[PDB]
Structure 1
Amino acid sequence: ALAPEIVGEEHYQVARKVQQTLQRYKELQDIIAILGMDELSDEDKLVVHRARRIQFFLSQNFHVAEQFTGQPGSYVPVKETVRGFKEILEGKYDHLPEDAFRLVGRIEEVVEKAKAMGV
């Protein structure tokens, strides 16, 4: 069902761009392990910076996961998650820490958690 005519052109584009970014992030980890982040370019440093945040934002809190976490779950609409991923790829939230995207849900929750942690 992941085709432009079925899921929408912008949805398909943002999903494929996220996939490409993650796959490129996978391509850099050996270089990072052997050399350190200092050998990367300013653009590739930004790519890794955004890719870690995307990977953490792919996580979610489940209602049935209360038995393991304590925190309640959340429901994320498709349009909301598409907009959030488009914003993250645009860079509106590069300044926030990567762990601010762990198990959150909406970007409206990412910003709230970032404010809560006192950064």
Structure 2
Amino acid sequence: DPAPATTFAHLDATTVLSRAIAELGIYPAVDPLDSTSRIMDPNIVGSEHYDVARGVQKILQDYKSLQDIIAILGMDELSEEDKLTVSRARKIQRFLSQPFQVAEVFTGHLGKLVPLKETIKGFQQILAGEYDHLPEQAFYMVGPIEEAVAKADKLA
């Protein structure tokens, strides 16, 4: 439509808020696959940044595939490989969630302003597999990976 079309001529990125994601409890309810940016170019964010990002997404993409199989044919023809993509992806998906300081007035949970450096390191490692042993709820609503570690402590 002319209104929207015209508008995109100027936009450098989109932040797609998703009801589907929220309903899973995930917050901020941003869509990791639909939300985009012009500057997501290695030539701009640098190879590292760029690669991690491109890592987060593919994995998130792959899991989406299996999502269909899992529910129907059951979660087990899954390979030593197909089982890791998931595990991680599921750790990832969560790590992508986060506590806001604006929502402290009664979220009980303290807010986190994760730094870019910490952001790439974080996901870097999950991809890497440093915390594959770590469990899901260790990553839900935390800041830097360090908190993913400590939450696990508090969670046996």
Unaligned residue ranges in structure 1 (runs of 5+): none
Equivalent residue number for residue 46 of structure 1: 84
Supply the distance in 1 between the matched residues of 2:64 and 2:111 (Cα, whole angstroms). Answer: 29
- Counting only pairs closer than 5 Å after superposition, residues 1-119 of structure 1 correspond to structure 2 as 1-117=39-155, 119=156
SS state at 1:8 partner = helix
Max Rg structure: 2
Give CA-to-partner distance per residue, 1:22-55, whole Å, 9 cap, x none.
0111111110000111111110011101000000
Q: What is the deviation of 1:67?
A: 3.1
Give CA-to-partner distance per residue, 1:60-112, whole Å, 9 cap, x none.
10011113411110111111110111111011101111111000010111111
SS state at 2:105 partner = helix
Supply the distance in 2 between the matched residues of 1:39 and 1:68 (Cα, whole angstroms). Answer: 43
SS state at 2:142 partner = coil
Supply the distance in 1 between the matched residues of 2:104 and 2:85 (Cα, whole angstroms). Answer: 33
Aligned length: 118
TM-score (norm 1): 0.95
Supply the distance in 2 between the matched residues of 1:71 and 1:19 (Cα, whole angstroms). Answer: 28
Identity fraction in percent:
66
Supply the distance in 1 between the matched residues of 2:46 and 2:66 (Cα, whole angstroms). Answer: 31
Supply the distance in 2 between the matched residues of 1:65 and 1:44 (Cα, whole angstroms). Answer: 37
Tell me which amino acid in the other structure corresponds to 2:103.
A
SS state at 1:42 partner = coil
Q: Give RMSD over aligned pairs.
A: 0.9
